[PDB]
């Protein structure tokens, strides 16, 4: 279940953003819609979908059996194809296109409002759950470098009937 990860990166001459995959990267400071199927060719590396608790979707053949090639293999894709959590697994997804742009599809977990639960001006960036906060998941720093200074809190969020205990990154 690590083979599944899609790992195609080019090129890092400009920014060395790629390092972000392994550890914190010296990004320059400061520069700071449905979901279906994405080909594994343009994906480096992990794809994060939110329920809204963050979840990892690995490569699978279309459709839908999992592939343990690093994608790599041409058939490898990510099947998202999803509907909001009352009732669905996730609101939206974020990943990195191979050149190092961040691709977001679907909608942020905040969207439940309504209103006033999403950020004040609405969104180009991130899985917000609060005008000030977004979800914290292991590749957030890599996906959203601007959030490096964000404080982290333990947070309850209720979707439909289910209750999610999740970590949040706030201003």
């Amino acid at each position, epitope marked *: 279940h690590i083979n599944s990860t899609a790992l*195609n990166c080019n*090129e*890092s001459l400009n920014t060395g953003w790629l390092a972000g995959l392994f550890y914190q990267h010296k990004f320059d400071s400061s520069g700071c819609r449905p979901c279906g199927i994405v080909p594994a060719k343009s994906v480096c*590396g992990p794809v994060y979908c939110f329920t809204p608790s963050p979840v990892v979707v690995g490569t699978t053949d279309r459709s839908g059996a999992p592939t343990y090639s690093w994608g*790599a293999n041409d058939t490898d894709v990510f099947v998202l194809n999803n509907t909001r959590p009352p009732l669905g697994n996730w609101f939206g997804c974020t990943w990195m296109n191979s050149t190092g742009f961040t691709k977001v599809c679907g909608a942020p977990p905040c969207v439940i409002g309504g209103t006033l639960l999403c950020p004040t001006d609405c969104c180009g960036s991130g899985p917000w759950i609060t005008p000030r906060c977004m979800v914290d998941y292991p590749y957030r720093l890599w996906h959203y470098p601007c959030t490096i200074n964000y404080t982290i809190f333990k947070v309850r969020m209720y979707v439909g009937g289910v209750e999610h205990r999740l970590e949040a990154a706030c201003n």
Partner: antibody
Amino acid sequence: LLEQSGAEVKKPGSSVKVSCETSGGTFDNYALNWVRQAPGQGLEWIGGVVPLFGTTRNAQKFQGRVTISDDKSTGTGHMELRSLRSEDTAVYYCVRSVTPRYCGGGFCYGEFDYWGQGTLVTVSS
Amino acid sequence: ELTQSPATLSVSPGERATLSCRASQSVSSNLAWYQQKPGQAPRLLIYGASTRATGIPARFSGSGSGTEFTLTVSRLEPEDSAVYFCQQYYRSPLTFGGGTKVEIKR
């Protein structure tokens, strides 16, 4: 800042184990590669490993035997080469890389940032 | 798959020493220049064909793309007495250049 194991002599067909240590360790390195240098000829790439994915990659001349293990705990690298040849006699460099430029997958590619002291491996009876 | 020319260079201090690297197959910008001083391990001079590494003086200057590369040492100092190598990180097998030995004239 990268220290390698002391020079060794082994009979043809035997095995060598060369280590690597970092003082002070451990820093952010994503890949551990090895590059040997025969006195007659220029540098030759042996192989490498990215410890985060556990994916190894070698060259045709060493495809069968060599295994490179990178321990992240103590930041200690290891290259073991078995069934040595007379042309295997060279100065073996331990090299580590920070900042990838390309990933085929699993393996990642980048320039070599830090080299080791070098280890003279002598294959002689 | 890398050809460094010339094999041997000899040049006065304060003058420019240029080294050519030619790949048999295109390697885009995935080329790196290293310096090997007598009895020491190689030092990373340039990566990405023309990007200087940290701590390397501006007199060192990488150039070129595709199959065609050149390394420039503008203001030579006796410390530059070393053998310089080129190495590509593009194609499946990693390859080094033959290596150019640089002699400082005095």
